[PDB]
Amino acid sequence: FEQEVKNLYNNILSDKNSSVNLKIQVLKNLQTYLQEEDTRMQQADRDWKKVAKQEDLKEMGDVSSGMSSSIMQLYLKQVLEAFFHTQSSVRHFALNVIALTLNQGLIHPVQCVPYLIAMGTDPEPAMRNKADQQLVEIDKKYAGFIHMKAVAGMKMSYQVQQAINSALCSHLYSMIRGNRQHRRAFLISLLNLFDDTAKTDVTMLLYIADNLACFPYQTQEEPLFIMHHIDITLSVSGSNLLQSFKESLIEFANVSQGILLLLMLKQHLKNLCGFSDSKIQKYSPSESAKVYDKAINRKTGVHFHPKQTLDFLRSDMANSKITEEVKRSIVKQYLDFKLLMEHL
Amino acid sequence: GFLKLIEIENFKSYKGRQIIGPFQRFTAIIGPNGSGKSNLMDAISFVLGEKTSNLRVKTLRDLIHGAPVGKPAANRAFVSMVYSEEGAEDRTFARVIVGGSSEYKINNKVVQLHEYSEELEKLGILIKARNFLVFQGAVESIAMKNPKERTALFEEISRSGELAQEYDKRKKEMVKAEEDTQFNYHRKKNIAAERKEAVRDKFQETSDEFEAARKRAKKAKQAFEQIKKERFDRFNACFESVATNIDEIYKALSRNSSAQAFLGPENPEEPYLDGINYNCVAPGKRFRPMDNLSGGEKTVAALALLFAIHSYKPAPFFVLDQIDAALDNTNIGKVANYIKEQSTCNFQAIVISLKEEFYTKAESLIGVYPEQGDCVISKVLTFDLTKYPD
Amino acid sequence: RKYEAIQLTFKQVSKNFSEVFQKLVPGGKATLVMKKGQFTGVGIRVSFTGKQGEMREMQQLSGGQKSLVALALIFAIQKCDPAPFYLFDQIDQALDAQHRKAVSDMIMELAVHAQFITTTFRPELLESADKFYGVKFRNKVSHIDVITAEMAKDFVEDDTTHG
Amino acid sequence: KRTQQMLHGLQRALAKTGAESISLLELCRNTNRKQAAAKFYSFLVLKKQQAIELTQEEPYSDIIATPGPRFHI
Amino acid sequence: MYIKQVIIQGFRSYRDQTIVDPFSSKHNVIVGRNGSGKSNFFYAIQFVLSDEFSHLRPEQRLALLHEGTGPRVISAFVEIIFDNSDNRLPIDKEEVSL
DNA sequence: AAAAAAAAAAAAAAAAAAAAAAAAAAAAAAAAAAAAAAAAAAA
DNA sequence: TTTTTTTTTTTTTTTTTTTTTTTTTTTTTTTTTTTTTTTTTTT
Ligand SMILES: Nc1ncnc2c1ncn2[C@@H]1O[C@H](COP(=O)(O)OP(=O)(O)NP(=O)(O)O)[C@@H](O)[C@H]1O
Ligand SMILES: Nc1ncnc2c1ncn2[C@@H]1O[C@H](COP(=O)(O)OP(=O)(O)NP(=O)(O)O)[C@@H](O)[C@H]1O
Ligand SMILES: [Mg+2]
Ligand SMILES: [Mg+2]
Numbered sequence A: 001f002e003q004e005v006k007n008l009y010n011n012i013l014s015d016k017n018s019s020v021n022l023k024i025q026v027l028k029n030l031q032t033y034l035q036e037e038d039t040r041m042q043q044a045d046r047d048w049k050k051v052a053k054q055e056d057l058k059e060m061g062d063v064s065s066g067m068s069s070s071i072m073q074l075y076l077k078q079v080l081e082a083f084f085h086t087q088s089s090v091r092h093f094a095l096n097v098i099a100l101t102l103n104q105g106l107i108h109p110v111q112c113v114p115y116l117i118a119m120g121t122d123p124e125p126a127m128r129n130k131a132d133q134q135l136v137e138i139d140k141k142y143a144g145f146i147h148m149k150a151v152a153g154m155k156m157s158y159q160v161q162q163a164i165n166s167a168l169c170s171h172l173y174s175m176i177r178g179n180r181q182h183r184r185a186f187l188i189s190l191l192n193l194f195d196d197t198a199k200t201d202v203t204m205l206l207y208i209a210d211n212l213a214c215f216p217y218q219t220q221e222e223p224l225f226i227m228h229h230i231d232i233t234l235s236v237s238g239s240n241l242l243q244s245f246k247e248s249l250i251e252f253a254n255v256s257q258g259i260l261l262l263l264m265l266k267q268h269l270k271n272l273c274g275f276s277d278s279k280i281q282k283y284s285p286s287e288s289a290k291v292y293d294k295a296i297n298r299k300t301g302v303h304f305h306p307k308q309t310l311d312f313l314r315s316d317m318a319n320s321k322i323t324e325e326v327k328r329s330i331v332k333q334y335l336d337f338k339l340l341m342e343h344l
Numbered sequence B: 001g002f003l004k005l006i007e008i009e010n011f012k013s014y015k016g017r018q019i020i021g022p023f024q025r026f027t028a029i030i031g032p033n034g035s036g037k038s039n040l041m042d043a044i045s046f047v048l049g050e051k052t053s054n055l056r057v058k059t060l061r062d063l064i065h066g067a068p069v070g071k072p073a074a075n076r077a078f079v080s081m082v083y084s085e086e087g088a089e090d091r092t093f094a095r096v097i098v099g100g101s102s103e104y105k106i107n108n109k110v111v112q113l114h115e116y117s118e119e120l121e122k123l124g125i126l127i128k129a130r131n132f133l134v135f136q137g138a139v140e141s142i143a144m145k146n147p148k149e150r151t152a153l154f155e156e157i158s159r160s161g162e163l164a165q166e167y168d169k170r171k172k173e174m175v176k177a178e179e180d181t182q183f184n185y186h187r188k189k190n191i192a193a194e195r196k197e198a199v200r201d202k203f204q205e206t207s208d209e210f211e212a213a214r215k216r217a218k219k220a221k222q223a224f225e226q227i228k229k230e231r232f233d234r235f236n237a238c239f240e241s242v243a244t245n246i247d248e249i250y251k252a253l254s255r256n257s258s259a260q261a262f263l264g265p266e267n268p269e270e271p272y273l274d275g276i277n278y279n280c281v282a283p284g285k286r287f288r289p290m291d292n293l294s295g296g297e298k299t300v301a302a303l304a305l306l307f308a309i310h311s312y313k314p315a316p317f318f319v320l321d322q323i324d325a326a327l328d329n330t331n332i333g334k335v336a337n338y339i340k341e342q343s344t345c346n347f348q349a350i351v352i353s354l355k356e357e358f359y360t361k362a363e364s365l366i367g368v369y370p371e372q373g374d375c376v377i378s379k380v381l382t383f384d385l386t387k388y389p390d
Numbered sequence C: 001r002k003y004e005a006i007q008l009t010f011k012q013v014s015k016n017f018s019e020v021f022q023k024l025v026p027g028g029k030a031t032l033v034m035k036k037g038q039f040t041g042v043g044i045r046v047s048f049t050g051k052q053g054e055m056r057e058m059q060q061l062s063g064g065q066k067s068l069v070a071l072a073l074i075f076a077i078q079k080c081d082p083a084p085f086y087l088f089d090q091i092d093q094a095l096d097a098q099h100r101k102a103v104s105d106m107i108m109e110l111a112v113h114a115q116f117i118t119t120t121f122r123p124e125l126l127e128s129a130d131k132f133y134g135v136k137f138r139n140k141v142s143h144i145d146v147i148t149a150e151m152a153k154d155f156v157e158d159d160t161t162h163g
Numbered sequence D: 001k002r003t004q005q006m007l008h009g010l011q012r013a014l015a016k017t018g019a020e021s022i023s024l025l026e027l028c029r030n031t032n033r034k035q036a037a038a039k040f041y042s043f044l045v046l047k048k049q050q051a052i053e054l055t056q057e058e059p060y061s062d063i064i065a066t067p068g069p070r071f072h073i
Numbered sequence E: 001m002y003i004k005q006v007i008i009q010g011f012r013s014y015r016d017q018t019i020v021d022p023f024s025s026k027h028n029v030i031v032g033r034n035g036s037g038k039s040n041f042f043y044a045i046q047f048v049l050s051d052e053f054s055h056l057r058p059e060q061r062l063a064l065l066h067e068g069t070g071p072r073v074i075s076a077f078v079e080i081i082f083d084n085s086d087n088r089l090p091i092d093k094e095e096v097s098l
Numbered sequence F: 001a002a003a004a005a006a007a008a009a010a011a012a013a014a015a016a017a018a019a020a021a022a023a024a025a026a027a028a029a030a031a032a033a034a035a036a037a038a039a040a041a042a043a
Numbered sequence G: 001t002t003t004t005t006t007t008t009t010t011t012t013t014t015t016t017t018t019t020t021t022t023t024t025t026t027t028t029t030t031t032t033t034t035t036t037t038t039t040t041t042t043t
Helices: A003-012 A021-045 A067-081 A089-102 A114-118 A125-141 A151-164 A170-176 A180-194 A202-214 A221-247 A250-273 A277-282 A305-316 A324-342 B038-047 B113-123 B138-143 B147-157 B164-197 B200-253 B295-312 B329-343 C002-024 C063-080 C097-110 C123-127 C149-158 D002-014 D033-048 E039-049 E058-062
Strands: B002-009 B017-019 B026-028 B078-085 B089-098 B101-106 B261-265 B276-280 B317-321 B348-352 B364-371 B377-384 C029-034 C042-047 C085-088 C115-119 C134-138 C141-145 D053-055 D064-066 E003-009 E028-030 E077-082
Touching: A003 A021, A003 A067, A021 A067, A021 A089, A067 A089, A089 A125, A114 A125, A114 A151, A125 A170, A125 E058, A151 A180, A151 A202, A170 A180, A180 A202, A180 A221, A202 A250, A202 A305, A221 A250, A221 A277, A221 A324, A221 B164, A221 B200, A250 A305, A250 A324, B002 B038, B002 B348, B026 B329, B038 B078, B038 B089, B038 B317, B101 B113, B138 B295, B147 B200, B147 B276, B164 B200, B200 B261, B200 B295, B200 B329, B261 B295, B276 B295, B295 B329, B329 B348, B364 D033, C002 C029, C002 C063, C002 C097, C042 C063, C063 C097, C097 C123, C115 E039, C123 C149, C134 C149, D002 D033, D033 D053, E003 E039, E039 E077
Parallel strands: B026 B348, B026 B364, B317 B348, C085 C115, C115 E028
Antiparallel strands: B002 B017, B002 B078, B078 B089, B089 B101, B261 B276, B364 B377, C029 C042, C134 C141, D053 D064, E003 E077
């Protein structure tokens, strides 16, 4: 509780320190405190009868019990921030501290769900194994929680990947899959809020599209839903843009990359399922719950989305210049756009 | 300002004309069972307007004295307070019932309901919101309220409920326009394909139709975005104020430092459309769902939520009616200490209680006693308590 | 045979209820009326402090009065045909000390038939008890054991502090 | 019953002056807060059982008490 | 009939609750500080003898186990021993256990 | 001659209620392993 | 009367399939209110 110790830890854990042994040492201090306190509490409770007759009935102490909680509330936030470190030992120790905290319920769980989700995409297997197991335990007790922090999850995930360098976050979808409302909402949120009119970084769009194509599906309702809304937005937005370009430019480069990425996602989906355009246009949202219950057949080795999307990102890659070659690439992009709108 | 005094006549077991004494900053209303004090709270709940079902009597005619026994007393009733704020003026609200109907009066001038309401809203009493009247069993209920009702309350208090019909009407308009644009686009595409397979008039028809539909869609889009932005901004302001203050308030009220309370929404892009939930941690225990917690923590949690909601937008007074239903002497002492430490310069608070540890800290008492008759006729008499030690 | 049994037991329960409730409240009276009939419901008519003019219905009463009515009904149905054991949790919270004395004396008389477990936070209700208990909550677990009348009567009222 | 003990206190407090008027301010003249509240509440619970009739004129003023029907004399 | 005593392990906040000196016949009042956990006693007594409690969702069953410290339990058990000396309960013994 | 008080009919509202579709815990069935018990033999 | 292998019966466990049941809006109905409409009284 002392002020100097407080400021000491809250400076070492933050402030972009050169040392990486101080941070490891701090996290190890917290970890050993938590473990030792837990063991002491348990093994001191086990032998009650020797001291029972000499303890009050009207007191019900808390300062010996609540203390272990209070401590965390002074440091917790900083520890969570330490997930975004380039070293690996720091990340491992931070995850150990959080997984010792939560397993005694000391702190409120749904404020450290997003970080615990973005920790689901590390290379080392033991890391994300521990993380995902912690997540399924957080869910199995409390039904709602994960649905509250789902998009912030992916945002933190993308920040983690840009700090380090199937689907990376497929597990999250497996957890949120069951409920029709939840799933539907989540999909619409991510899609409508990231591609249509948000000036998001051209890399986050790539990442979202990669994850939208990779996701494990176990019915037929989901890709048809995605395709349907994709259709509507593509139609309106693309039509407006292309017709204004015909009436008539880096802004075009940006919005064109957006719509093109969305196009290629649609095409990869349609090729991975091989569904007839008639069936797609026939389907409407909430037509019936049980009609599209068939398991989607998958053609082997049709994954061309990664290569294709990287090719079309290499076409742009935030490259605007006062040179003839980019103008040529842009006119080809426009003719390609006409071809895309002509796809049948 | 505050609530100076009220006046009853024939209303719900208060025969004759009598003046309830002037109210100090923090009073208490003691008395033995069946004396009829909690309906005095109903009296306060009747001036400010309240649906009859919450007044624990059907049909609104059984308010007049002596109806539940079988013989009424008159065909009138007359309840009226005198709100007094700084500036040496005094306003007198009333609400008289005749036959079945009810008429409202301000300063002995007949008015219509809407202006009466708006006058109260000017004062600061969101009558339909009901964030400051607690009935006997309501306090426990507030903590366990289903998320939907809590969203309803938070939308009511914050003036973001009036903008509903406009919003979803705009929503339906834009969804229809978008569907029709897609329809026309695909029809034009298939007509183009059937043309290339080889008609002209149909092509131009669907083209012009698609153009008109697009224009209407764009007309719907920005307007929907405008109204949704409005509702979101208002709701979000109110909600963030409540959240920060509930955390601080709960820590202060439990006189500990290991308690948390998280007031969190679902669907955090449009919080007004989905239920909000409330999870609190005990003073010295683990995180458990709200249902599991014992009654003693439940009542402190509900008190925390009430005080936070009030601490966003002020309300001149409370009416607490037996909040100490289940609290032990220590917890009641803590709650009473907080009420005393807050009551001076923040809000007037009038409580009904039985445990002497709650009306001992009080500063002015109002005894309420019965008298035998054709029906139990109640009467009132006051007592000062700021001329005594400890 | 079923209809006949219904009739006789309703009669006995009606009489016992009128007796108990006349005893609990110092002054008043109440009875159980059947509905139209086959039968469809049982209504209750209660009156006190006027004793002849008053004839009430249920929704407009007090905490103490409602709790007294309910307790009267339960004690009646006990006095007709005893049940294995009764467990009361925080029964006395709404009512006042005078009624609490009445309820405790009725418990004291009725004890000799069935087993009674109950909790409370006010002294009067343990005016009549065989053996008390306590519940201590240390190290995030709760234990239960026997205690003596002195420490219990002290904990219930005698101390008023932060511990 | 503490209440009837205080009732005996009332009987003896009245039989000394005989002006059939037990004032409350005097009976609480030299006490602390808790016992003052207790005494006031005791007057109320006594008035319930008709054993005493009490009078109050002004909104904030002393209480004047006098024996009623069931004083038991 | 006459509840002799109760045994609880891992139910709601009772880790390991061995035997207690037996109840009486007349009146056994329980007191305890606010939030101590007296109501869980009656929830045990009702969880065994009354069917209504066991109509909950699987989540509630998962949440009806002492999750305090150390490992997490999986097998809770509540036992009640009472004596039908008056042979009110038909199966003839002196202390029926359930 | 015209303001006022008082009952009655029409209209908005709200709570009991009739209805339908997605979901979910539960009951029934079937196969395999295991565990207690009867039968000829026997000590 | 009591022990043993072999056979016979019970029962127990674990999946898959059917079944009641809870919920989830949506719609309908009915009582309450209240505003207007209708009807004598009086200054
Ligand atoms: N309209 C009425 N006219 C006359 N008496 C009534 C009326 N409504 C209720 N009562 C009775 O008058 C008393 C008022 O009840 P109530 O106001 O609830 O008392 P109380 O203040 O709650 N008692 P308590 O909470 O125990 O201190 C009760 O006896 C009612 O039965
Ligand atoms: N499954 C559980 N595991 C661990 N602790 C639990 C569990 N369920 C409840 N608790 C806690 O155990 C305590 C139970 O309190 P409870 O048994 O309701 O006491 P109480 O005596 O009724 N309080 P009061 O209202 O004064 O009577 C609370 O602190 C709960 O949060
Ligand atoms: Mg009350
Ligand atoms: Mg309790």
